[PDB]
Design a protein around this nucleic acid. Structure first.
Ligand SMILES: [Mg+2]
Length: 810
RNA sequence: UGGAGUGUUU
């Protein structure tokens, strides 16, 4: 239950010079002093806690603190660069915030030794977190009051004009900051950042932007049920201010303000029902302009605190955690994507303006931050060859993380003779003209790809509505012999997609392939090729395999590769559960992957039923190959902070699945966490190594020195080619390894596994198993109908046994 | 839903 040490340093691949957004920190020798701060009441937010501690330090300057500049992490912890004149006992005093007052006790609580961290960085020892957290607090104290903190990032509306996304949302620009340990030194990781916030505006205007109103006067009428529930879902949980006191919106009343009532006790003591409108006429002398609109129920969901919309504004600086519309993300993408050189410059600018060496609290603790990016030597791993089949078994060589299928044919292409078309797009748009020509050009590329689709579609008729899918599909399977695949047309976003997969994947076992209307009216060879990549594996074929003799040693004895991830409800609602997914390789290529899915507790990241899921996959492996794996390689999607709560349940769960399968069956387990959500960015030092318009590092770039863990087994690997914006290099952390991998073999194996993703002829940013796991879980979300007990939910995500033996999630 | 990659006190 302890991460293994780094076994060695990789030597494979050609070196290139890199720079990381990790800035060396010169940490003094001292023993800083940590004091505990309890604040009555303990409920107010960190922001208030900071101003409480701020004015306290000025109020008790000559009394307690002196010429010092302590740092405060919000919450209950305060630090100083030399002892405070309180010794050890618990002092108590009073804080008056510009009227309310707060009580604060300050008692010394042990002493954080910085010289001890030095030793842990110089090989000896693990690393103590209490000293890393102490440093983090020091570096964050000033930004915490100077800007709006969000996790480990800092944001502000310091102009930048306004970047709207619509629907009462806008993009703010800030920066991430974190203190990270490495070999022989501490690192300050700095990166530019951007996230969506709610526009601070009158709620009235917020209602307009959410339902597309040029102005509120558009609706002289009350809201319909759809508008009210759409508006409710948008404002639920947001904070508002009165026209200042702020509340939290827990609901939107059904009745308008002119009729919504609350109990009001009269001077006599008898309670009478009073309307929100009347109360605001009598108590505040304000005649509501929009009495036909609903009210905002705030505070406790029973205090009957109702506020008219026209006397409320959205509070400034609320991160939008709800899901963004497709159009909103595109605008965010286009507005935040920067090429590697641009982003590198933006980070340099951040360093200049930040001016850490002149921050009073930072220099109070004697810390220096090198203004230049750390120099790092990376290694560009050689890519694997991709063995194709057909006539001449062409061998593709990835170039810059990319290859094509030209003059190449699938390894095991499938001959598809009988098939159908189910067009839900209006004929007058997708006329019979488009259908045929689409099929014709779709047979040409199919022939060229080694997946010949002979003959014409045995059946091709129109349809409309999500209710016509179940019966039509029933008619399809029972009526056509050897029906392999059903192509479906869709006119943009439609709930018919869910029913098509929910039916094709679960209630029957017929592979389906959906395609948007526009991709049929205007065919394209490369779009058709990518489409053929998917159906070939959906029907059991093998698009390609790694060049077998190019594989690393691990493939000697039988081995199974697993990927695991948990998808959560897209946004805030606890009536829908989280979905766990685990996939496993079923051959030695490795190409085919069998999937397992589990519905579990809402927003639970731990895979609760992992033991059973691994059991399933081990059995399916044995049936597919007649072998029992001697090694289990487990690629687990990144985790918050919870490594050991993940390493404890999930590692034991995997081991429990081997020994409940068969006493004395003990395969070596390798547990690797794969993380994309970090702010480590690598840049080419030499202009000549830049790749593409975005000038990113090349696919295969690997780093396991200088910026990696001082003792444990972790490394970065940018397996993919950056198309738009700056590449995110995947981080891999080996939590457990019974198999005693070398650095090189593990990095190469990880890299090669990124070349087995069947949906594209490119190296992907994470190994295929971890990627498939995400596709499975996401596919389980479409198994969810409205047009909910645990057993009923878990039954919907159960896949038809015929489709199970394929990669239906592709 | 061709695909990858780029940002996340009423
Ligand atoms: Mg995940």
């Amino acid at each position: 239950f302890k991460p293994p040490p780094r076994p060695d340093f990789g030597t494979s691949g050609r070196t290139i010079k890199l720079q990381a957004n990790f800035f060396e920190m010169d940490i003094p020798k001292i023993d800083i002093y940590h004091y505990e701060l309890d604040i009555k009441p303990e409920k107010c937010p960190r922001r208030v806690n900071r101003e409480i501690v701020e004015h306290m330090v000025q109020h008790f300057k000559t009394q307690i603190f002196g010429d010092r500049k302590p740092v405060f992490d919000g919450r209950k912890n305060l630090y100083t660069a030399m002892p405070l004149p309180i010794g050890r006992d618990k002092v108590e005093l009073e804080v008056t915030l510009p009227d309310r007052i707060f009580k604060v006790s300050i008692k010394w609580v042990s002493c954080v030794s910085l010289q001890a961290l030095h030793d842990a960085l110089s090989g000896r020892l693990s690393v103590p977190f209490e000293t890393i957290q102490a440093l983090d607090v020091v570096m964050r104290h000033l930004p915490s009051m100077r800007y709006t903190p969000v996790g480990r990032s800092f944001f502000t509306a310091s102009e930048g004009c306004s970047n709207p996304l619509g629907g009462g949302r806008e993009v703010w620009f800030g920066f991430h900051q974190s203190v990270r340990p490495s070999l022989w030194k501490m690192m300050l990781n700095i990166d530019v950042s951007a996230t969506a916030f709610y526009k601070a505006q009158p709620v009235i205007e917020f209602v307009c932007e959410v339902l597309d109103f040029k102005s509120i006067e558009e609706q002289q009428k009350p809201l319909t049920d759809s508008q009210r529930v759409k508006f409710t879902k948008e404002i639920k949980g947001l904070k508002v201010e009165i026209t200042k006191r702020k509340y939290r919106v827990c609901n939107v009343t059904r009745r308008p303000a002119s009729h919504q009532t609350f109990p009001l006790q009269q001077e006599s003591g008898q309670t009478v029902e009073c309307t929100v409108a009347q109360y605001f006429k009598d108590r505040h002398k304000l005649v509501l302009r929009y009495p036909h609109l609903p009210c905002l129920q705030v505070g406790q969901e029973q205090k009957h605190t109702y506020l008219p919309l026209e006397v409320c504004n959205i509070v400034a600086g609320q991160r939008c955690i709800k899901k963004l519309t497709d159009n909103q993300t595109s605008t965010m993408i286009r507005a935040t994507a920067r090429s590697a050189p641009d982003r590198q410059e933006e980070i340099s600018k951040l360093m200049r303006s930040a001016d850490f060496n002149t921050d009073p609290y930072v220099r109070e603790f004697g810390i220096m931050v090198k203004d230049e990016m750390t120099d790092v030597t990376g290694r560009v791993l050689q890519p694997p060859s991709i063995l194709y089949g057909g006539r001449n078994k062409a061998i593709a060589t990835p170039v810059q993380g990319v290859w094509d299928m030209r003059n190449k044919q699938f390894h095991t292409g499938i001959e598809i003779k009988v098939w159908a078309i189910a067009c839900f797009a209006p004929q007058r748009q997708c006329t019979e003209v488009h259908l045929k020509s689409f099929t014709e050009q779709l047979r040409k590329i199919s022939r060229d790809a080694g997946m010949p689709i002979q003959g014409q579609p045995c059946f091709c008729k129109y349809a409309q509505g999500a209710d016509s899918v179940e019966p039509m599909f029933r008619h399809l399977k029972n009526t056509y012999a050897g029906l392999q695949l059903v192509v479906v047309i869709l006119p943009g976003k439609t709930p018919v997609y869910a029913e098509v997969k929910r039916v094709g994947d679960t209630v029957l076992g017929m592979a389906t392939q959906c395609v948007q209307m526009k991709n049929v009216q205007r065919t394209t060879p490369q779009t058709l090729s990518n489409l053929c990549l998917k159906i070939n594996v959906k029907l059991g074929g093998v698009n390609n395999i790694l060049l077998p003799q190019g594989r690393p040693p691990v493939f000697q004895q039988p081995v199974i590769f697993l990927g695991a991830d948990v998808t959560h409800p897209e946004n805030g609602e606890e009536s829908s559960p989280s979905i766990a997914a685990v996939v496993g390789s079923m051959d030695a290529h490795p190409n085919r992957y069998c999937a397992t899915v589990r519905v579990q507790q809402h927003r639970q990241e731990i895979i609760q039923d992992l033991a059973a899921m691994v059991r399933e996959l081990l059995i399916q492996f044995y049936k597919s190959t007649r072998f029992k794996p001697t090694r289990i390689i487990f690629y687990r999607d990144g985790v918050s902070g919870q490594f050991q709560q993940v390493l404890h349940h999930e590692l034991l769960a995997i081991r429990e699945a081997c020994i409940k399968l068969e006493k004395d069956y003990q395969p070596g387990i390798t547990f690797i966490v794969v993380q994309k959500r970090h702010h480590t960015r690598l840049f080419c030092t030499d202009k000549n190594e830049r790749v593409g318009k975005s000038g990113n590092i090349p696919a295969g770039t690997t780093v396991d020195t200088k910026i990696t863990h001082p003792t444990e087994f972790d490394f970065y690997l940018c397996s993919h080619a950056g198309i738009q914006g700056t590449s995110r290099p995947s981080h891999y952390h080996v939590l457990w390894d019974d198999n005693r991998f070398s650095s090189d073999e593990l990095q190469i194996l990880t890299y090669q596994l990124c070349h087995t993703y069947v949906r594209c002829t490119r190296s992907v940013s994470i190994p295929a198993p971890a990627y498939y796991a995400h596709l499975v879980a996401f596919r389980a979300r479409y198994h969810l109908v409205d047009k909910r007990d645990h057993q009923a939910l878990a039954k919907a995500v159960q896949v038809h046994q015929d489709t199970l033996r394929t990669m239906y999630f592709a």
